Amino acid sequence: HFAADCCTSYISQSIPCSLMKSYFETSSECSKPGVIFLTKKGRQVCAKPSGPGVQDCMKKLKPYSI
């Protein structure tokens, strides 16, 4: 029961990938895209589309080594 999410601002420091269980990209329909990581502790972080290390965090969040 939700809709497309969007980031209003990116974090001010490196992304906390050491505590995120998954990650998701917003919809291009928003005036500004962005990928938010979902933390297992029940939280959300806002990051750019190609943030330095942000893509590495989402890469490790996807088990596909086979």
Side-chain angles (χ1 to χ4, degrees), residues 21-23 55-65:
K21 73 194 242 265
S22 217
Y23 74 85
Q55 252 255 304
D56 193 350
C57 302
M58 309 145 73
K59 219 76 206 240
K60 252 288 174 174
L61 251 42
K62 183 198 294 167
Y64 226 102
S65 176

Side-chain angles (χ1 to χ4, degrees), residues 6-35:
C6 293
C7 261
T8 189
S9 63
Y10 303 116
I11 79 293
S12 14
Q13 71 183 16
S14 31
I15 280 289
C17 312
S18 249
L19 252 101
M20 315 268 216
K21 73 194 242 265
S22 217
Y23 74 85
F24 84 76
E25 70 222 304
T26 61
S27 309
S28 217
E29 201 270 354
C30 248
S31 213
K32 43 174 91 130
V35 38

Side-chain angles (χ1 to χ4, degrees), residues 16-22 37-45:
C17 312
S18 249
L19 252 101
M20 315 268 216
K21 73 194 242 265
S22 217
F37 294 75
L38 243 299
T39 77
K40 178 137 164 219
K41 241 161 79 74
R43 218 103 141 125
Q44 51 152 230
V45 164

